[PDB]
Design a protein around this ligand. Structure first.
Ligand code: CA
Ligand code: CA
Ligand code: CA
Ligand code: CA
Ligand code: CA
Ligand code: CA
Ligand code: CA
Lengths: 170, 169
């Protein structure tokens, strides 16, 4: 949160290309770097817009952008903490450390399912945007799971329908 | 399966615009109409290609396309059967009739969830392409569920991991 408003408003005006006073997903995406030289995951860019857009306008204003800026800044720090070999991509073992550090207790084999599902380069090494994405979706599905797991034991009983409106809970 | 090879090979060559001898995901999209004046759902088009693509060439050849052609024809027929008020879009009541006719036994309120998830127009009326997608995904997930539901009673017990591992489908 270190920078002043002057800095972050100069940043805002820069990212707000059409000068409409609202940063759109399209504009945020161009501001963001995933390190790989490919456009920042658009699904992730939209996830971040609607987390910080309160007044439903498919965008963020200056005040909400300062939160966007902080949310991105915090994720970057997390990324570099668990990017131990300094490669700019998170691998399976790095992902195991990151998720364990988030308090997740998940088997080895599952981390492969994770990389497969969220790695867009298909190299088995996760870029900054796909790591945010994988994580946003994890925390989303844990919440859903905790809604149902009344004794929080990590096991639930579901009907076929309950089950289906959980996979359509995403 | 009523037209001759001549007919469907003529079709094939029109759709096969770069003439590589393989119909790709892009070229089939331009062949398909959803009725709504928008590009045929590209995910569905992807699903249909890799259902019929056996040589993993991100596309289909002539023989495989004849199957693509039949698969789409069968779907058009199903769509028209349940499109009962003749509007070109499946509504909730029509969707309840279709799914029940497929042998699904689902509650009223679940049909709202299905429409919201797969109606890419956002009017609560489902176009041809989104009805295929809805249905593809439905039967795809019924299969996942039946792998786990040992006594096929319609109830499973899942761990948080099993849950995530099967929800990533
Ligand atoms: Ca703008
Ligand atoms: Ca690394
Ligand atoms: Ca429980
Ligand atoms: Ca071609
Ligand atoms: Ca209708
Ligand atoms: Ca009719
Ligand atoms: Ca059972």
């Amino acid at each position: 949160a270190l920078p002043d408003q002057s800095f972050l408003w100069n940043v805002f005006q820069r990212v707000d290309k059409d000068r409409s006073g609202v940063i759109s997903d399209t504009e945020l995406q161009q501001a963001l770097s995933n390190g790989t030289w490919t456009p920042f995951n658009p699904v992730t860019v939209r996830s971040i817009i609607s987390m910080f857009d309160r007044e439903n306008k498919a965008g963020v204003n200056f005040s909400e952008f300062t939160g966007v800026w902080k949310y991105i800044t915090d994720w970057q720090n997390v990324f570099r903490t668990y990017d131990r070999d300094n490669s700019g991509m998170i691998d399976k073992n790095e992902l195991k450390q990151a998720l364990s550090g988030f308090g997740y207790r998940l088997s080895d084999q599952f981390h492969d399912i994770l990389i497969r599902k969220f790695d867009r380069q298909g190299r088995g090494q996760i870029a900054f945007d796909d790591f945010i994405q994988g994580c946003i979706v994890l925390q989303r599905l844990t919440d859903i799971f905790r809604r149902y797991d009344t004794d929080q034991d990590g096991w639930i009983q579901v009907s076929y329908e309950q089950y289906l409106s959980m996979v359509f809970s995403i």
